[PDB]
Design an enzyme around this catalytic site. Structure first.
Site, short mmCIF file in Angstrom:
data_model
loop_
_atom_site.label_atom_id
_atom_site.label_comp_id
_atom_site.label_asym_id
_atom_site.label_seq_id
_atom_site.Cartn_x
_atom_site.Cartn_y
_atom_site.Cartn_z
N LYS A 1 37.61 3.26 2.46
CA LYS A 1 37.61 3.72 3.84
C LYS A 1 38.19 2.76 4.87
CE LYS A 1 35.91 7.82 3.04
NZ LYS A 1 36.82 9.01 3.10
N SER B 1 29.70 7.24 -6.55
CA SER B 1 30.92 8.04 -6.60
C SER B 1 31.87 7.39 -7.60
CB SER B 1 31.56 8.14 -5.22
OG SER B 1 32.04 6.88 -4.78
#
Length: 271
Positions: free
Chosen positions: A45, A229
Site C-alpha cells: 500500500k 492475505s
C-alpha cells in the site's frame, strides 16, 4: 548497488522476488514471491499512497504544507501517514475506529491527525465523515508490473495476487500481458459494449484455514513471514504451480509482513 536518495518515498517500489525452495513439490512450476513488505512502510500500500499524492500534486491540487483528508484504513492508512510526512503535507485520516492503541501510536508518530468513525459503519462511515469535513473545512480529498518483467525476464507463466491489492493487479496486468501474451492472472479472495476480462483470468478462493497453513509453512521453511492475505496468495500460487508443472514459472504478491499481525490468530500459539 547501495543506494542514496533524497526522500524515503524514493524507496517505495522495486521490491525483490524470492524463489521458493522447500514448500514446493518436485513436480510444480517454480514459484517466486515478490515481497512488498520490503517497502519503507512495509506493505504494498505504500505504492497507492504515493501514487494518490503524486496525482494530486501533478494536478496542482496540492501546495507545500497543505492539509489533505482521506477516508482510509489498514495498510493504506499507514502508507498515507508516512508519505504525507515525507512530502510535508498535513494528513487528516478518517478511519473506522477498529484499530489498536499501538496502531494509533504509529499513525500519530508520522504526524497524522486521526478522526475515528463508528467501527460498525466501516468505510462507508469514514467516507461520509470525510465528505462532511470537506464541506465544513474545504480540505482537499484525493510500476509493479514493470518491475516484474525485469525480474522474471523472458518468462512468466502465471501471476497471483490478492484482491486486497486492488488496482495493483489491475495496473500490473496491462504490462504483464504485453510482455507475456500467454500469461494467466489470478485474483485471490477470502473463502468468507464488450466485457473486459483483461484484469484477471480466474478467481481463486482460499479458506482462512488454508491461508494460515501456507503462511505458517513459508515462515518456518523459507523464512518468509507474511500476513494472512499473504498465506492466501502462497496457497493459490502453489495450487496454480502444481497444475502448470515443471519448467513453468509463477509469481505471487506478498502484501505485508507478519510482524504487523502478531495479535491475530495467524501466529498465535498454544501456551
Amino acid at each position: 548497488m547501495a543506494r542514496t536518495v533524497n526522500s524515503i518515498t524514493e524507496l517505495i517500489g522495486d521490491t525483490p522476488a524470492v524463489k521458493l525452495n522447500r514448500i514446493v513439490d518436485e513436480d510444480s512450476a517454480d514459484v517466486y514471491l515478490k515481497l512488498e513488505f520490503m517497502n519503507p512502510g512495509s506493505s504494498v500500500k505504500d505504492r497507492i499512497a504515493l501514487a494518490m499524492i503524486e496525482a494530486a500534486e501533478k494536478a496542482g491540487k496540492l501546495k507545500p504544507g497543505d492539509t489533505i483528508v482521506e477516508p482510509t484504513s489498514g495498510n493504506t492508512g499507514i502508507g498515507l501517514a508516512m508519505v504525507a510526512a515525507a512530502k510535508g503535507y498535513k494528513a487528516v485520516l478518517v478511519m473506522p475506529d477498529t484499530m489498536s492503541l499501538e496502531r494509533r501510536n504509529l499513525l500519530r508518530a508520522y504526524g497524522a491527525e486521526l478522526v475515528l468513525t463508528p467501527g460498525a459503519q466501516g468505510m462507508r462511515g469514514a467516507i461520509a465523515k470525510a465528505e462532511e469535513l470537506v464541506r465544513e473545512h474545504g480540505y482537499f480529498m484525493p510500476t509493479t508490473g514493470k518491475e516484474i518483467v525485469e525480474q522474471m525476464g523472458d518468462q512468466l507463466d502465471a501471476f497471483v495476487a490478492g484482491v486486497g491489492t486492488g488496482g495493483t493487479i489491475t495496473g500490473a496486468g496491462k504490462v504483464l500481458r504485453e510482455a507475456y501474451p500467454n500469461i494467466k492472472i489470478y485474483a485471490v479472495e477470502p473463502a468468507d459494449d464488450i466485457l473486459d476480462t483483461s484484469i484477471y483470468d480466474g478467481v481463486i478462493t482460499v479458506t482462512t484455514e488454508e491461508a494460515f497453513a501456507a503462511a505458517r509453512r513459508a515462515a518456518r521453511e523459507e523464512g518468509i513471514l507474511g500476513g494472512i492475505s499473504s498465506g492466501a496468495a502462497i496457497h493459490a500460487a502453489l495450487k496454480v504451480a502444481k497444475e502448470l508443472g515443471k519448467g513453468k514459472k509463477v509469481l505471487a504478491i506478498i502484501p505485508s509482513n507478519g510482524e504487523r499481525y502478531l495479535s491475530t490468530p495467524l501466529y498465535q500459539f498454544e501456551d
